[model samples]
Target: YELTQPPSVSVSPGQTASITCSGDKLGDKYAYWYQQKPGQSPVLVIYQDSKRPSGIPERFSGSNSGNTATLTISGTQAMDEADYYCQAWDSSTAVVFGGGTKLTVL
Candidate 1:
């Protein structure tokens, strides 16, 4: 299964940001979204495709349709400039991660 995502994106503060991830095996389980800032570990933002974790802000969201999944960030902030990654379990019970998306808050 091949997970796919954008290599990069740029957004201004107060605006919205968007990225997507998908693959052949995306149907096997719910998609998960992670945010990784420089010099830090990735933090889970969205899980079960649409639920936010305890500390994650309301601005971050995730969704999926068929084999496609997406991540969205609203009212983008300077702190939102980070690398985003996506993960999903496949039919083989293998975890698949897409290449990170570099987000620029300009």
Candidate 2:
């Protein structure tokens, strides 16, 4: 998914923040959001940044704003996370993933 062009954020450790992963500009009709945990690999938290995988809790979500898209994980958990990222097709030629937001578990 695409962000609001300049895709940027304001957050601190131990706080709640949400990133909107946009698909409007992206040619693909569908996309997914993933998370990477420490000493572990990445997990599909929200497909399209909204649809949670079967075992994932209700804290994760996906949505859009104008042309920007979003993913929101609330409260933050020990396992509630990792580096958050958004990925989508940059047309049929390649895949685009956001520069990961590292979630430090404090």
Candidate 3:
């Protein structure tokens, strides 16, 4: 399945933001979320049906309905202003990633 995401999202300090991923073939596979800061490699935030990686903050979460998946940040922070991407495992054992969304902190 191929994924699509918004180019960006904006949030005020101490607020929250969310991005959605859409794929016609997303099926029932688990949705995942990743974050990438400036000059840094992407890090997994949420995986395998809303499970957070060790040391990841609870503010990051994943949810899906129909052919769409969503990644939400509960409390906006300056450090959270970065690129976010959503991914999903397909039946063919391929992980598809959304184009990515830039979170701008105002």
RMSD of 1: 1.7
**Candidate 3: which stretches are off by over 4 Å?**
none
lDDT by residue (tens digit), candidate 1, 1-106: 2689999989888899999998874766788888999899989999988899998889998898888899999999898889998998554676788898999988
Q: 1 or 2, which is superior by TM-score?
A: 1
Q: Candidate 2, residues 1-106: lDDT per residue as tens digits?
A: 2333224444555466676555455434455777777668778877753578899878777764455666776776666546677777443557765666655546
Record all residue pairs in model 1 with backbone atoms less than 3 Å apart, i.e. clashing: none
TM-score of every model? Answer: 0.91, 0.68, 0.90
lDDT, candidate 3, 1-106, per-residue tens: 2789999899998887888899885658788888988799989998875788999888888788888888888888888888988888866787877888999999
TM-score leaderboard ranking: 1, 3, 2
- True lDDT of residue 63, candidate 2: 68
Q: List the candidate 1 regions with Cα displacement exceeding 4 Å.
A: 90-92
Q: What are the lDDT figures for the candidates, one per model?
A: 0.87, 0.62, 0.84
- The lDDT of model 3 is 0.84
